[PDB]
Amino acid sequence: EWQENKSWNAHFTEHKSQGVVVLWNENKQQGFTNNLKRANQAFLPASTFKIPNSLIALDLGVVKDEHQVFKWDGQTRDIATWNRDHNLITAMKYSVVPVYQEFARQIGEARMSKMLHAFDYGNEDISGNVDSFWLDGGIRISATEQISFLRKLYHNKLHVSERSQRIVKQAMLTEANGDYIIRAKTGYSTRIEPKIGWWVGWVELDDNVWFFAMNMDMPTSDGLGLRQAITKEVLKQEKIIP
Template structure:
């Protein structure tokens, strides 16, 4: 059995008179430029766009790590770590929370029938549960969740989550892919920390189910709960990997985003993040 010693930061809200969760502060973050070498190491593996073939550019990306026990953050670029981007499929985390809390999704076992429309991704062309829809990042399922949630409730709950810039304008069923909402790597970590500690303005049950759906990797050394994202409609396209690493005595939160000029580069989201986690001795 894994036991976790967590150093939570609580403040008293003058409005509600009850404990609320404190976000990370700017002073808690340190810049570690040596990580740039890992991005450079994989530069040759990046498939360039036609423009980049004419004008080669350095791969742009950031990894942000937060040590929960020490309440300390590290990143290779504080500027980019604070820059907002479309969340793309990392938005499936708050979308799931809202759908569960409103009863649109009953539980992790409910089956959502395939609409019969064949799409390019094979795993989308079948019935789904919340677990599989999260695992395979099934956009049509989450678009239906959003339509059932509705504009007013979506906007209200995203604001209550303090999620990024909280701007849900755009098409209700695609604003996280091509709308005005933006979130930074550090804001992703602030949101994930609240989720881990059950401090989101949603039921503890909803948060527990979403964390179950985020399960990505389990072994004898650590557990990873995470979600990928690919903002293909952005220019340049942006890849995400956000989540946390559970250890026996600590939790490390991470958020990475990088320019992704081609689909072939998508595995670099996890590869680069894990290389940095190994460099910092978070995982073996």
């Protein structure tokens, strides 16, 4: 069950933003959102797709491990951090699209589609073709669907090996300290309206895990840090993090 807490809207309002945050309390098997409607609206996953894309690439052997280097092709792209060599960890961290497009090509459309279906991932539509569908094709996923997917990953219940899932959860590591561990993935969908930012993942506490998936309208790149800030503004309000 899901509970709407419209008070979280203040965190969007304060930052002159519109969006949804969805939380799931694993112990209590309860979910919370500021906007049930938008929680169930599907959007392009953009770089959040790196999570399933990694799982599949690892499981098929397209990526041997998290150390394998994927050389910069020497083509300066807009994003400075992309113009360097990468492995899975840093490719995830810096959302290095070109690396994952190459994975997607090597995976191919048949295996990609089968695996997404096996994952129950979003609308499971990769039209098309292989190497951009999460950016400007047909694949869409809602925040509540992201939670469902993430929960399976956390529990190693996705239809790939345990190793693949552990490696991807490693690669998702975003922040940790004595109070919490956040494993998550950002996304930024720009190719198709509405432009949105994502942050999906979970917060590991000593005794519980809180899954989250947020997206928000992102008319310009200026607002990208709000993905995390608003999520954390909500996590703080809910005493999940200090």
